[PDB]
Design a protein around this ligand. Structure first.
Ligand SMILES: O=C(O)CCC(=O)C(=O)O
Ligand SMILES: O=C(O)CCC(=O)C(=O)O
Ligand SMILES: [Fe+3]
Ligand SMILES: [Fe+3]
Lengths: 558, 558
């Protein structure tokens, strides 16, 4: 048997097979398996060499990933699955993996039943330093089992600190993965990792590659049997796709994309002004935080003109010298002298973790009562007991925790307190008057968040604004959300190192803004329904978190 | 001189006059004066006797006062200012008070200028136990100087503990009086108190009469001179009335009549249900606070029917036995064993004082950061820095104050903590689902306040609901405010003693609800634009404060 002989002879042994089936049954957080030294060593070495000589990889980055790919439609990479003339060993590899012999073995140990021999579905990718793939479940089309065969250097050990681990996530509920993974597989040459595709459950990701090494892999899927194949059931595939394609789940997303309506006093002030002038006292108040260049008569005129022309502002050195210096000092001190929580269970007041991880992950201060979501019950409690932001109470709580601890260089809340003070400034009636002056728009609601995006952990994905549905019938209220981001990231290397963390606004060139983290910048965007936004995953190589203050307002023409 | 001789001879003495003018100039909180032994003693004694024999007084109560009056249009009291046949001494008294001789004296010492001799304007009233007159400024029509001549028993001293003091209020700003008075005059027979009417400033009230005594007085006004009189200036009166008749001041009112919009999760739950059923788990949650009789299938059906027919509910024994007993214990303990603040400066977290006192006075917990409004600056700071309610943070702050003090029978916050727990129950998603079930209305916003109305201090006046102006164009949102009051007043005697504190709803029989304070009642009223509501001034004779929880929701047909 020329097929059987191209695999490790152990895989044809009944005792081995039963042992592996048991391993898979007993695995966590959902059923998965691995086999070491799977394929004939000479064959797999020859495949690696063919790939190196015949395939050219191209970096592709999206919100969800950065991966060096070879699957371009025109086959300019050199990989054409319809014509493997220059890769005969790869041809042999695909043939043996989709053989009846292997499929019968593989379907048995995974309890997946019959698998398609003809619907071959493989991809060849490399992950180099900074490459990653964020949380997802693989539930697409007729996929039945996911597999990844790893081909890093056969004569060197791939090490845990290299990154590139396959990580698997437990679930709080179906389609609601826990923020932190519970298993990690470190890939080696000729090792295969695999799992039955599980709608709602099979959440996994590829840990960023943290060093200058090349993680080469062949990712594939076994599919539901097709017409004329063993195990084919007419209608099975159609039913599977339908049941996986066909908004209760938004309840499990935190923070909520919700704004609170402003006071009668506030709205009157904005209306009165826009039906042109700030008092000297009001300018004095603004000058406590904002640079003089953005408060001068001609500075304001320029900003007003820019907003009219672009429906956005990108302001540099937004905060004045005093506040910029204060914030830089306290943020740098926290970055360099304090320990950051790197698991949601370890996050303490005033911080929360954005969830679920197939949508976002980051730390935030919202001014609401402390939440740490580890169980379904924790989430249900929050939903039954909505509370509203209160930044002064949050400040108060911080002082009491701090005074109990001693307020040292290791545990002080100087950064959080300074950032909350900044949030309170932006919550002030006078700030919103200034915002109204710049935009000729009348804020009627607000949400303010302080965010920290940790290296190797944090990101958001491309999403649209959420309109205040109670305000939809109001003809004065514009069909848009005004969104501000005050970036306070003190480290460098973001652009040159491609460290992620950039704020991206695009139309659904479609890119409106692509802004790597910087220090003391203020972005303002009037978002209509279609505009997409995200903050890119922050690389482990970043020398600080991305820190910012995120602000959102419903607005009326005034 | 028959006129001069009917007054104390001292008032015609230049040295006396100048001394009095100086007293008035140097007085606080606004210029006022008093003269002792003003009138011929025999004359004033004869006037008192005529009043006792010839005038019948009738108790009249409104939101602002309770006073035994004699000014009925038909003159059934026996007092007819056009025919004093049976009161010739009263005739003589009016004549001398409006004489040129007296007006020249009175106008001089008050720096009020000329006064009308013909536009006589007097009223005769008695204040008996429980009678009072709340804060007001006397600024009506052509009134120039206010005076009150007191005629209690001439042969007994009126004592401070009798009450019935004339109290004068300082101002934070024009038309914004301080909550607490800064001067009090204790009336005696033949004593006159007076002040120039001052738009924006001349705020005064009559302290409740606290004992079974009869405070008889003649209140009057001197007016701007009329045509043909000394000092008449054509157009003066018209200009005065115009400048006093012709909404910035709502900024100074606390608490704000403002509701916060509910979460997306909440509104979805109500919509889903009303487009009929609560789960067993939801009933279990409700049963923690609410009596079984209001959660049963037929109990609910009855309430639903009552609300359909009346657009209101009046529920007795609302809370279950466990919670009723807990709340009664802690409220009674606070009433009987702890000291209540009786000046706004003495009110501490978590309590605030409703202001200004010509509109309302009471203590409330709103869950917002602590405020104590003693200056204009204090108010302006709050207005520039709006914050939102957070009951858990309020609870947290209470524990830290309590643990610093020792948590004794004298200083514990057991009542406040139990009341906040109750507020949190009513803030729960499941409670609002139950509310939606009872009413077939869909809450979309909320405000919850805990209120304490102290004996001898606290009240509100008749006002309409305030619509959420941002929601006016929404056709689904009903032009009404749903309003709940959970009364938790543990003392008795309210109705029999006429102790005030009643909750009054009336159409602008017009009375919808007149409900004296009781224990564990829940009133629910769907208020359209016109419906007026107030809580009547609580008598010093009440044996506890009125305690309640006030709830307001915007609602849609769902
Ligand atoms: O390379 C891996 O380990 C897994 C890749 C993956 O999950 C995917 O491409 O869907
Ligand atoms: O009787 C008093 O002392 C004052 C009465 C009063 O202020 C009034 O009737 O307007
Ligand atoms: Fe995958
Ligand atoms: Fe008065």
């Amino acid at each position: 048997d020329k097929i059987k002989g191209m695999f490790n002879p152990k895989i044809w042994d009944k005792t081995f097979q039963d042992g592996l089936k048991k391993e898979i049954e007993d695995s966590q957080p959902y059923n998965w398996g691995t086999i070491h030294e799977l394929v004939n060593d000479d064959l797999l070495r020859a495949v690696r060499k063919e790939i190196e000589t015949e395939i050219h990889f191209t970096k592709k980055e999206t919100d969800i990933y950065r991966v060096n790919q070879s699957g371009d439609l025109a086959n300019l990479s050199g990989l054409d699955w319809d014509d493997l003339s220059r890769l005969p060993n790869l041809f042999k590899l695909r043939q043996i993996l989709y053989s009846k012999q292997y499929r019968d073995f593989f379907g048995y140990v995974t309890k997946a039943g019959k698998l398609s021999g003809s619907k071959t579905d493989m991809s060849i990718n490399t992950y180099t330093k900074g490459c990653h793939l964020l949380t997802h479940d693989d539930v697409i089309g007729s996929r039945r089992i996911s597999f990844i065969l790893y081909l890093p250097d056969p004569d060197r050990k791939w090490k845990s600190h290299y990154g590139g681990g396959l990580r698997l996530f437990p679930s709080i509920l179906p389609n609601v993965p826990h923020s932190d993974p519970s298993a990690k597989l470190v890939p080696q040459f000729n090792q295969i990792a695999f799992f039955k595709v599980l709608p709602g459950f099979s959440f996994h990701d590829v840990e960023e590659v943290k060093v200058d090494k090349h993680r080469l892999s062949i990712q594939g899927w076994y599919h539901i049997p097709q017409v004329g194949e063993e195990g084919y059931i007419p209608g099975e595939e159609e039913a599977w796709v339908r049941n996986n394609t066909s908004n209760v789940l938004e309840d499990f997303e935190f923070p909520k994309d919700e704004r609170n309506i402003l006071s009668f006093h506030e709205v009157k002030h904005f209306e009165k002004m826009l039906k042109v002038k700030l008092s000297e006292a009001e300018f004095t108040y603004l000058s406590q935080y904002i640079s003089p260049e953005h408060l001068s008569s001609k500075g304001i005129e320029k900003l007003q003109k820019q907003f009219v022309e672009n429906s956005s502002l990108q302001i540099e050195s937004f905060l004045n010298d005093d506040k910029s210096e204060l914030l830089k000092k306290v943020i740098k001190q926290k970055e360099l002298e304090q320990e950051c929580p790197y698991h949601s269970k370890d996050v303490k007041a005033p911080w929360k973790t954005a969830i679920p991880p197939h949508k976002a992950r980051y730390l935030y201060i919202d001014g609401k009562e402390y939440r740490n979501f580890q169980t379904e019950a924790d989430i249900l409690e929050a939903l039954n007991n909505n509370d509203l932001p209160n930044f002064q109470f949050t400040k108060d709580a911080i002082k009491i925790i701090s005074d109990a601890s001693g307020n040292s260089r290791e545990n002080n809340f100087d950064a959080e307190l300074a950032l909350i003070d900044l949030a309170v400034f932006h919550k002030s009636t006078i700030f919103k008057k200034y915002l109204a002056l710049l935009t000729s728009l009348c804020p009627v609601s607000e949400q303010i968040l302080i965010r920290r995006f940790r290296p190797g952990m944090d990101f958001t994905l491309a999403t649209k604004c959420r309109f205040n549905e109670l305000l939809k019938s109001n003809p004065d209220i514009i069909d848009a959300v005004l969104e501000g981001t005050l970036c306070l990231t003190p480290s460098a290397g973001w652009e040159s190192g491609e460290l992620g963390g950039y704020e991206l606004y695009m139309m659904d060139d479609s890119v409106l803004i692509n802004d790597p983290p910087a220090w003391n910048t203020f972005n303002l965007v009037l978002r209509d329904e279609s505009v997409l936004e995200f903050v890119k995953y922050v690389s482990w190589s970043a020398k600080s978190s991305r820190w910012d203050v995120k602000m959102k307002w419903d607005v009326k023409s005034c």
